[PDB]
Design a protein around this ligand. Structure first.
Ligand SMILES: [Mg+2]
Ligand SMILES: [Mg+2]
Ligand SMILES: [Mg+2]
Ligand SMILES: [Mg+2]
Ligand SMILES: [Mg+2]
Ligand SMILES: [Mg+2]
Ligand SMILES: [Mg+2]
Ligand SMILES: [Mg+2]
Ligand SMILES: [Mg+2]
Ligand SMILES: [Mg+2]
Ligand SMILES: [Mg+2]
Ligand SMILES: [Mg+2]
Ligand SMILES: [Mg+2]
Ligand SMILES: [Mg+2]
Ligand SMILES: [Mg+2]
Ligand SMILES: [Mg+2]
Ligand SMILES: [Mg+2]
Ligand SMILES: [Mg+2]
Ligand SMILES: [Mg+2]
Ligand SMILES: [Mg+2]
Ligand SMILES: [Mg+2]
Lengths: 37, 185, 43, 144
RNA sequence: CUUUUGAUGUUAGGGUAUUGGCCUAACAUGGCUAUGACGGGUAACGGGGAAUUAGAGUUCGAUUCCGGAGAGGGAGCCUGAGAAAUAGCUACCACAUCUAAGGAAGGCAGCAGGCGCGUAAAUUACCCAAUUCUAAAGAAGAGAGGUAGUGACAAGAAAUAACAAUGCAAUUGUAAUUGGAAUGGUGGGAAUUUAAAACCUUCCCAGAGUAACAAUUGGAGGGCAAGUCUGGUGCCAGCAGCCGCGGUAAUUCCAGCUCCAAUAGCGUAUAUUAAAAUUGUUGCAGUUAAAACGCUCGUAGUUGAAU
RNA sequence: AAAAACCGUAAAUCCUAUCUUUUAAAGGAAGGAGAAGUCGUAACAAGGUUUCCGUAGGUGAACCUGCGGAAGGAUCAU
């Protein structure tokens, strides 16, 4: 998953929207862990 | 402590279990020489491979080298004494030409068959195993015995055998007994 | 939940006994018989 | 040049690269990782003993259709629980609620085999008698 | 990173069988480190060696010999040329034996043997005859050591017939029927062997015909050598390392017959080597299959014209 | 001889502080597998608004839009 990300030959979900979803979820996790420190 | 007497293996497996042509050749040889399994073919192959390896290593070596002279003379003498080379082909290149039938020809079974003295090769094997054969005033009952050059004129029946001038076996004497008590009753 | 069908077919098949004697050769004598059947008559 | 140093005093570089790059091989990393003594119910053994807890049936994969018979076993050695396949036609009827069984691997040491999903174990003995000698049905009878 | 409380050196002593921060007093500020110090891990005792490999290599070495360490866990001590000894002593921690209740006595990782642990391992036998050791040294003793018992760990040799006459297919085969030789396995007794038995050799007696004195373990779609034969089941039961088979005419399931493979042996599980030029020094690949840092400078490292 | 004192060699017990390994839990949030489920139709043809990259914002969901870039384009050309 380096330069081979976003490679499209099999009808999958877009790479950048998956990246955006992951970043949102990571932000929520960081907030949850901060609330407990 | 563990004992200091060691041991070694004498055979090796083919590494390719179901090859047709090798299997047919093995059956050829087994039927021709009257053997029991493939293990005997494989032991002879093992021995021949050792011989050939020594010969190859000696041949790659320099001429008029002491190692080559000593070990090559020893190996050639051993081979000619065994009855595998002969008289005009002692040159360390004829070692590489020895084939499986040549070694397989020196067994006591084959020798007992070829010198008359038995009606087949299976007869030859059964006679050796039943204490009927001598090799020079020593009684041998092992069919894989390899006969050396100066021992092949001394194969003959044993003095304790009914085929070699002794009393008859357990069947003859019981038949003769029954005949005696028949004729004296 | 449906494990009452176990061993169904093995218990369905009608039973047949073994056949009787027909003793086989062993060892060196068995290798001799094979050699005759495959090469002696085929020539 | 071809991407490597080739000099008479360049041994340290080659040694260190081969040391670092070996960890990308799956086989080497599987055999040399410290966690195998932990995430392995058999803990490096080839066989283990356990107590039968429950009989179950498992579905086969999509193109096939069957109900494969297995058991759930608690290991005596460490208390863990596993699932093992009972091979043969009517061999599940030879097993009772809590017997002692030997189980072994299933032939693909870390991997599932064929049609069953998520099963890596196989029963070989029950109640101190062989499953095969018991299926042959002409050799032995269960130790009552 | 080490150094307050010895870490690195100097001077003078103490101590030891001797040298030494080994220890004490004064003094100086040193010693190691990306060529990896200081730490963490090891299901790590080191070596002579072992397995597999054309040549390179990869993996193992508790265990016959050599060196090291220990005697439940630690620390002290006597005798003695030699011990920080443990079938020697003193104390604590843990475990545990007898008792008349005041007291006394313990250490199988020596040889047998038991419990527990587990996938995982033998006799509470005989002898100092050999190899050696100790002594007041032919003459005593030695679970050191040897001998047997148990023992499909591993290794070597090697039975389960052979031969005739007739009959029948192509000299031959035996598919078939008749008859006489040969021979161990087995039971009994001896000569020997051995400290004394026992085993191996050798000799005598009795002793094979369905020679019932009766060979097995896996397979028969392909890989991979060997049935498109006969019954049962009917996407169920099941098989199958991989591709796959099974839904009423299954060469693959359950059985009968017949064939193939190895054979007194043959299957299965886990680990490891070759196969793997799929770890590449010999010897890989990087436009598009996995993979050239966004770009330049730069120290260590590696490499450097001709005479 | 018993018994005391002192400088040493020092088992053991306790308190405190770290480090290592294993482990419980209301609740929260992922991934993989399965079953005829519900909703839409983003990709593959110019897929009916060419497809993608980086960054930022928004919406039940797949996604939409702004700024700069590429052709792996639907143009090697006036
Ligand atoms: Mg690429
Ligand atoms: Mg000082
Ligand atoms: Mg060692
Ligand atoms: Mg150990
Ligand atoms: Mg031992
Ligand atoms: Mg030692
Ligand atoms: Mg102990
Ligand atoms: Mg001590
Ligand atoms: Mg003791
Ligand atoms: Mg003690
Ligand atoms: Mg013991
Ligand atoms: Mg064992
Ligand atoms: Mg004297
Ligand atoms: Mg005496
Ligand atoms: Mg069949
Ligand atoms: Mg390999
Ligand atoms: Mg390789
Ligand atoms: Mg190679
Ligand atoms: Mg490659
Ligand atoms: Mg570039
Ligand atoms: Mg579109």
């Amino acid at each position: 998953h380096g330069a081979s990300r976003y490679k499209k030959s099999r009808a999958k979900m877009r790479w950048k929207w998956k990246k955006k979803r992951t970043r949102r979820l990571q932000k929520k996790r960081r907030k949850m862990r901060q609330r407990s420190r | 402590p563990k004992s200091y007497r060691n041991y070694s293996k004498t055979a090796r497996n083919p590494k390719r279990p179901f090859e047709k042509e090798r299997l047919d050749q093995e059956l050829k040889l087994i039927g021709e020489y009257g053997l029991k399994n493939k293990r005997e073919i494989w032991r002879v192959q093992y021995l021949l491979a050792k011989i050939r390896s020594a010969a190859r290593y000696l041949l790659t070596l320099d001429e008029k080298s002491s190692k080559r002279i000593f070990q090559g003379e020893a190996l050639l003498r051993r081979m000619v004494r065994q009855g595998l080379l002969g008289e005009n082909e002692e040159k360390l290149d004829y070692v590489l030409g020895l084939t499986l039938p040549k070694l397989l020809e020196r067994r006591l079974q084959t020798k007992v068959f070829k010198l008359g003295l038995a009606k087949s090769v299976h007869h030859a094997r059964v006679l050796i195993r039943q204490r009927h054969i001598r090799v020079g005033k020593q009684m041998v009952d092992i069919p894989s015995f390899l006969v050396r050059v100066d021992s092949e004129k001394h194969i003959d029946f044993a003095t304790t055998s009914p085929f070699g001038g002794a009393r008859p076996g357990r069947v003859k004497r019981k038949s003769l007994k029954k005949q005696k008590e028949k004729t004296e009753a | 939940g449906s494990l009452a069908r176990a061993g169904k077919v093995k218990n369905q098949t009608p039973k047949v006994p073994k056949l009787d004697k027909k003793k086989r050769l062993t060892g060196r004598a068995k290798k001799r018989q094979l050699y005759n059947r495959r090469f002696s008559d085929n020539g | 040049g071809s991407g490597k140093p080739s000099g008479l005093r360049a041994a340290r570089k080659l040694r260190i690269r081969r040391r670092t790059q070996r960890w990308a091989d799956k086989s080497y990393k599987k055999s040399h990782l410290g966690t195998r003594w932990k995430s392995n119910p058999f803990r490096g053994s080839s066989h283990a003993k356990g107590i039968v807890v429950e009989k179950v049936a498992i579905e086969a994969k999509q193109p096939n259709s069957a109900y494969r018979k297995c058991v759930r076993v608690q290991l005596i050695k460490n208390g863990k629980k596993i699932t093992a396949f009972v091979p043969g036609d009517g061999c599940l009827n030879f097993i009772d609620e809590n017997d002692e069984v030997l189980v072994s691997g299933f032939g693909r040491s870390g991997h599932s085999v064929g049609d069953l999903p998520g099963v890596k174990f196989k029963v070989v003995k029950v109640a101190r008698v062989s499953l095969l000698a018991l299926f042959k049905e002409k050799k032995e009878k269960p130790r009552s």
